[PDB]
Design a protein around this nucleic acid. Structure first.
Ligand code: SAH
Length: 544
DNA sequence: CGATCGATGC
DNA sequence: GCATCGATCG
C-alpha cells in the first residue's frame, strides 16, 4: 500500500472547504467578541484552517488557528501557506493527534480514512479499547472520538468523513457516540458526487457539543440520478456542482454532464443507532413505515441469507481452465465442483460455463473436515505449486487449519438444496432460483429456507427481492451505495426485507407467477413482472 | 464457525 | 467505469 493510502493524506478541495466553513460559522452561536479557537486535528497542508479564516475575516471575526498533523512535511507546507496568508495567530503541532492543549470553540476537520486491514489487527484493537469503538474500526472513527473531547461544550464541529458510518453495521459505535455527544444540526451525505479524486462517498457532520446541564436535526442528501422519469423536471440554473450544496429545495438539479437528485429533510430519531440512519423525505419515510406495519414478517424469519465461499485465493481455487493443465496437476473430478459467479446472474434464471472450484472440504464422520491431500494425488501436486501463497495466509495457520484449505468453505452438504442466488454488487436485483447443486462464489449471496420445505417460500422471497417495490424499499432503508448506483445486497440488509403473509391469496399468485418465470418465455416476462408489482402492492395493502 | 468492508482498483 | 476479494471481527 502507498504512503498516501496508509496515512489518509487526501486534502479537501478549497471550494468544498469553503462550504464547510460557511456552515460552521453560520451554526456558531458563540460570543464572537473575543478570539475564537479553531482546531484541525489532521490539518494536512492547512486548507481547512485557511478556508475558515477567510470566511471569518469577511465577518470581522478574529480566529486562533490550531492544526495538528503527524507528518512533518505536511506541517512544513501548512506553516508556509499560513504564514504567507498574512494571518499571525496560528499554531501548528507535529504529533500523533491520537497519542498512541486547551479545549477549542470550533473544530473543522477532514480526518484520514484508513480501513481496518491497513491499520492491521493489532493497532485496530488499541483504537477500539482507547476510544470505546466496536467492529471493523476505521481511523476516522477514532478521530471523531478524539477530536470531540477537544471541543468545549456548546462548541461547533464540522467534519467530513466517509459516509459509511451512516449505513454499516460497524458504524454503530460512531452513530451512538455522535447522537449522545452532540445536538446534531445537519448531516450532508455527498453520495457519489466525487469531490475527492479518491473513490469515496463522503458525509459532513455538523453538531453542537452537548452541555450535560429544543432542536430537530436535518439532513442534506445528493446523489447522481441516472434515470430521470418522464414526468420529472430538472433545474439547471446552477453552473457548478459546489453550488448545489447550498440548494434548499428538494428536486432534480443538473450541473450539465450530470443530473443530481437532492433531498432535504429531518433525520428521524437518530437515538435508534443500532439500525442504519435513514436520510429520507417525509413521504419516503411514511411509505417506509406503512410497509413495516403491514408486513407479515421479514426474510430473516423465513430463510438463511448466506454469503458464498470466501476462498482467500480465488485465482488458485476457482478456475475454468482445469482441463488444459499438466496431467499430473489436473485435480480429481470429485473435487471440481461447478460454481456460479456474479457475472452469470440474471432474474429468476441463470445464464454451465466450465467454471469449477477446487473444493477442499467434505463430510467425513458426520463432521465437516478438510480433505486429505495424500488421498488426491493430482490435486495434491497442484496445491503444492501455490504453497507459498497459500501458506503465507497467517490467519489460516492461526486457527490450526491446513495451508491448502478454502478459508470459508461453509457446509459441503448444503449446496445440494435448492436456493436463491444473487450478486452483492449490483444496480438491479438479480435473484434467481437454482436447484442443480452448484457452489456459490464469494461475490454472491445465497438463500435457503429455514423451514425444510423450499416449495413456495423461496419463490415468494424471489418475487419480492426482484421487484421495483423492494428496490424502492431498499433505497430508503439501506442507503449503502458504491459508484454508478451499485447497491450492496448483503446479509445485514436482505435479512430486513419485509415479506407479506405467504398464505394470502395475493402471495399465492405471486408464487405461481414466479414459478412460471423459473420452471418454464419471450418479452411477456415484463407482463408477469408488472402483474407481480400490483400483487405485491395488494399484499402490503398500499399503492406506491 | 461466517459475514463484513472497501480516501474501492484497475 | 463497474463490480472487487482477501484480511478482519465476533
Ligand atoms: N495519527 C495521526 N495524527 C495526526 N495527523 C494524522 C494522523 N494520521 C494521519 N494524519 C494526517 O491526517 C491528514 C488527513 S488529509 C486532510 C488534510 C486537511 N485537514 C484537509 O482537509 O485538507 C493527513 O495530512 C495525514 O498526515
Amino acid at each position: 500500500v502507498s504512503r498516501q493510502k496508509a496515512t489518509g493524506a487526501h486534502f479537501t478541495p478549497d471550494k468544498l472547504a469553503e462550504v464547510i466553513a460557511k456552515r460552521i460559522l453560520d451554526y456558531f452561536k458563540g460570543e464572537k467578541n473575543r478570539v475564537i479557537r479553531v482546531l484541525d486535528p489532521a490539518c494536512g497542508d492547512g486548507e481547512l484552517l485557511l478556508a475558515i479564516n477567510k470566511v471569518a475575516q469577511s465577518m470581522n471575526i478574529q480566529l486562533e488557528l490550531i492544526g495538528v498533523d503527524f507528518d512533518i512535511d505536511a506541517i512544513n507546507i501548512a506553516n508556509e501557506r499560513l504564514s504567507r496568508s498574512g494571518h499571525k495567530n496560528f499554531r501548528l503541532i507535529n504529533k500523533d493527534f491520537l497519542e498512541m492543549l486547551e479545549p477549542v470553540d470550533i473544530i473543522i476537520a477532514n480526518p484520514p480514512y484508513v480501513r481496518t486491514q491497513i491499520l492491521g489487527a493489532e493497532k485496530a484493537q488499541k483504537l477500539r479499547e482507547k476510544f470505546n469503538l466496536k467492529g471493523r474500526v476505521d481511523l476516522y472513527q477514532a478521530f471523531l472520538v478524539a477530536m470531540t473531547q477537544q471541543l468545549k461544550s456548546n462548541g461547533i464541529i464540522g467534519v467530513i468523513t466517509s459516509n459509511r458510518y451512516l449505513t454499516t453495521k460497524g458504524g454503530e459505535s460512531t452513530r451512538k457516540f455522535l447522537v449522545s455527544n452532540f445536538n446534531i444540526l445537519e448531516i450532508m451525505d455527498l453520495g457519489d458526487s466525487k469531490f475527492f479524486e479518491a473513490a469515496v462517498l463522503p458525509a459532513i457532520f455538523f453538531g453542537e457539543k452537548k452541555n450535560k446541564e429544543s432542536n430537530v436535526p436535518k439532513f442534506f442528501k445528493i446523489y447522481e440520478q441516472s434515470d430521470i422519469e418522464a414526468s420529472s423536471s430538472v433545474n439547471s440554473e446552477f453552473n457548478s456542482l459546489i453550488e448545489l450544496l447550498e440548494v434548499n429545495k428538494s428536486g432534480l438539479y443538473s450541473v450539465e454532464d450530470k443530473t443530481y437528485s437532492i433531498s432535504l429533510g429531518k433525520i428521524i430519531s437518530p437515538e435508534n443507532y443500532k439500525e442504519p440512519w435513514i436520510l429520507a423525505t417525509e413521504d419516503e419515510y411514511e411509505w417506509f413505515m406503512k410497509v413495516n406495519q403491514n408486513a407479515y414478517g421479514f426474510i430473516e424469519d423465513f430463510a438463511h441469507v448466506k454469503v458464498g465461499i470466501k476462498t482467500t485465493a480465488d485465482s488458485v481455487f476457482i478456475r475454468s481452465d482445469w482441463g488444459e493443465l499438466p496431467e499430473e496437476q489436473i485435480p480429481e473430478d470429485k473435487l471440481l465442483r461447478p460454481i456460479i459467479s456474479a457475472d452469470q446472474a440474471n432474474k429468476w434464471s441463470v445464464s454451465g460455463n466450465n467454471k469449477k472450484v477446487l473444493y477442499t472440504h467434505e463430510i467425513r464422520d458426520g463432521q465437516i473436515k478438510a480433505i486429505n491431500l495424500e488421498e488426491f494425488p493430482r490435486a495434491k501436486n497442484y496445491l503444492e505449486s501455490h504453497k507459498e501463497r497459500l501458506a503465507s495466509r497467517k490467519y489460516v495457520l492461526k486457527a490450526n487449519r491446513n495451508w491448502y484449505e478454502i478459508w470459508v468453505p461453509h457446509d459441503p452438504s448444503l449446496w445440494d438444496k435448492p436456493k436463491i442466488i444473487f450478486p452483492d454488487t449490483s444496480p438491479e436485483p438479480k435473484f434467481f432460483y437454482e436447484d442443480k447443486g452448484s457452489v456459490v462464489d464469494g461475490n454472491c449471496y445465497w438463500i435457503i429456507p429455514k423451514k425444510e420445505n423450499s416449495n413456495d417460500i423461496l419463490f415468494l422471497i424471489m418475487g419480492i427481492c426482484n421487484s421495483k417495490f423492494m428496490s424502492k424499499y431498499h433505497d430508503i432503508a439501506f442507503q449503502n451505495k458504491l459508484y454508478a448506483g451499485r447497491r450492496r445486497y448483503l446479509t445485514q440488509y436482505v435479512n430486513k426485507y419485509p415479506i407479506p403473509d405467504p398464505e394470502s391469496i395475493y402471495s399465492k399468485e405471486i408464487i405461481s407467477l414466479v414459478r412460471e418465470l423459473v420452471n418454464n418465455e419471450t418479452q411477456d416476462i415484463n407482463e408477469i413482472e408488472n402483474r407481480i408489482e400490483k400483487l405485491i402492492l395488494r399484499a402490503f395493502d398500499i399503492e406506491s
